[PDB]
Amino acid sequence: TSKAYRAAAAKVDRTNLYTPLQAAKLAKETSSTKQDATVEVAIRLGVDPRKADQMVRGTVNLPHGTGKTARVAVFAVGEKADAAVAAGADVVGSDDLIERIQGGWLEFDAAIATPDQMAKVGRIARVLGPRGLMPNPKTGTVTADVAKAVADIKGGKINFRVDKQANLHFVIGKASFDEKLLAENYGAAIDEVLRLKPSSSKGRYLKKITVSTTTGPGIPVDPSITRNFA
Amino acid sequence: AAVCDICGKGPGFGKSVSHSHRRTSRRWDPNIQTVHAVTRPGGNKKRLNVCTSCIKAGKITR
Amino acid sequence: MKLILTADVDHLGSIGDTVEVKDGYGRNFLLPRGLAIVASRGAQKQA
RNA sequence: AACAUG
RNA sequence: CGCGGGGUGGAGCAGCCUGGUAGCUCGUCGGGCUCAUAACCCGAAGGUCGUCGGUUCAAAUCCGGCCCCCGCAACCA
RNA sequence: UCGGUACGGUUUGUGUAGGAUAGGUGGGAGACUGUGAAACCUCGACGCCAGUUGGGGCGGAGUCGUUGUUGAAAUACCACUCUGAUCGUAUUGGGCAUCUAACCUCGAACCCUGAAUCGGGUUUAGGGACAGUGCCUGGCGGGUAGUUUAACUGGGGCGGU
RNA sequence: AGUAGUGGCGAGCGAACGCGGAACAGGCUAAACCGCACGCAUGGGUAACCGGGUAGGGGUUGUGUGUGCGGGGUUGUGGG
Ligand SMILES: [Mg+2]
Ligand SMILES: [Mg+2]
Ligand SMILES: [Mg+2]
Ligand SMILES: [Mg+2]
Ligand SMILES: [Mg+2]
Ligand SMILES: [Mg+2]
Ligand SMILES: [Mg+2]
Ligand SMILES: [Mg+2]
Ligand SMILES: [Mg+2]
Ligand SMILES: [Mg+2]
Ligand SMILES: [Zn+2]
């Protein structure tokens, strides 16, 4: 109320556009007084998500990770569970896994369902609604190759999906990361958005972008720099 | 009027072209305005027809 | 066009200096009444 | 406001 | 060709800018009311919400797909 | 006197269970003088769903929220958005009303003028940035103009082709 | 050369570059600036000017600008 709002205008300025060098710098200076946080990047695209052919959805790999625990639940039995027991599946259960989740146990950060289990995991996806824990074949979580699917979560491969009002929101890593671990994540962030530009888009594509945190203010960032993030 | 009393700029004739490219004759008339001009400050006023490209310069006084 | 005004004109400026005028306030009011002159040679008569 | 018949 | 509106029960229409009941009037049947008949009042019957396919917890309402209808503008193989 | 544009500030929204599903997405789960809309007092609509957390004019002398769970459900924080309202900055544009000096007067008097219901010039009484005209532009336009209105056909016309 | 092209690319319309001849020729002004007159302004040792310098004297006709008439000027290797 008092300290958090007065800490905004002492460092950043609204009208002054900031470089991607200075944005990650102020991301280290804003979150230093409070605890650690996730440096949030909000992207305002110039497409309409209401048209289904202009729908933007894809993946993007963070080579420096994001600092996430990644409790990956794997829905597999038999030799499909043997392909993930060496991949890093922490909880390998049985056919009663339908009943353990409905009892009040939702302690997993990722859900990977094999196609041999998709007739039974579909009863679990109702309680996994708002927090975003249901298995999705469009994001690469429903496949027969679950050995490489565990390492996709541990590397921090973010699955982005544009909202109702064309405002992307993207994470790059924790506040404990350096100025170059976040910038190379931010350097590979915008370019994969430009590769995921739709076909029939008009106007200016990446109009507004900013850098924010969990419990702090934002950073005005200039889309003019798409080449020199390093 | 359509003749400037100073520079002699009269009208020009041309054609008015439609969408079916039917050409008929119209006339480009100059922007002739009336002025009450003096020859020395405080003297009498003579009425003239001048064009607006001479009022924009200093060919007359008022 | 620019002018050099001689007398005191309100909301327009002081005396001696040049001023911007909107070309119809000049030759209808300022120039026939003698309150202003054109600025071609008057910049040296002012100096 | 309301209706009229045998 | 471009803009932005319209389609709902046997008939005539609300509801659509705010996603959730889907209705009212007329007509058909049956019942009330009256000494009795008209007039009146009520219930029930009657819905592919023009069609499909997605968004979506959920669509008559939002977006596209065609299907007929209309308004204004366009229309130099 | 009004309006939209970029940006900034505040505020607005929602079913039976919940600070009425933050309205929506994405992050993230402890933040600061919050007594209590008892007061001095909170809205301009919301006072219907549901009473809003500001009109902080105050009491600052202390503490709420983040922890429990339920429709799908989170509830502090807090993000940049959506609908409506408002303030401020900057820019741009349109109405309405006074002024006189461009312009207009078939209003008047005087003079050129000896003979002038023409014309011009001077003074005065009024209209006034409107009208009229030039250029560019949309409409309306048998008022007017140039032309078109096919062929077969037991004759042309009607049907048919 | 009825060529390049141009055309309800219909009917049609229609160049130039260049080569061969006929005939040959080039001249004045405006402006900058310096004077004279007229017109306006500014100023009385504030200051100059009186052909330049040299010295004094004059003891205000200097200084600036507007309008005509003389001087100066006429170029593409740029000329003034
Ligand atoms: Mg004449
Ligand atoms: Mg001609
Ligand atoms: Mg002709
Ligand atoms: Mg011109
Ligand atoms: Mg002008
Ligand atoms: Mg005719
Ligand atoms: Mg003819
Ligand atoms: Mg016949
Ligand atoms: Mg020759
Ligand atoms: Mg000369
Ligand atoms: Zn003229």
From Swiss-Prot, chain A:
GO terms for cellular component: cytosol; large ribosomal subunit; peptidoglycan-based cell wall; plasma membrane. One of its GO terms (biological process) is translation. Gene3D superfamilies: 3.30.190.20, 3.40.50.790. It holds the Pfam family Ribosomal_L1. It comes from the Bacteria. Keywords: Repressor, Ribonucleoprotein, Ribosomal protein, RNA-binding, rRNA-binding, Translation regulation, tRNA-binding. GO terms for molecular function: rRNA binding; structural constituent of ribosome; tRNA binding. Binds directly to 23S rRNA. The L1 stalk is quite mobile in the ribosome, and is involved in E site tRNA release. Protein L1 is also a translational repressor protein, it controls the translation of the L11 operon by binding to its mRNA. Belongs to the universal ribosomal protein uL1 family. Part of the 50S ribosomal subunit. This is Large ribosomal subunit protein uL1. It comes from Mycobacterium tuberculosis (strain ATCC 25618 / H37Rv).
UniProtKB/Swiss-Prot annotation, chain C:
Signal peptide: none annotated. It comes from the Bacteria. Belongs to the bacterial ribosomal protein bL9 family. Binds to the 23S rRNA. This is Large ribosomal subunit protein bL9. It comes from Mycobacterium tuberculosis (strain ATCC 25618 / H37Rv). The gene is rplI. The chain holds residues 1 to 47 of 152 of the full protein.
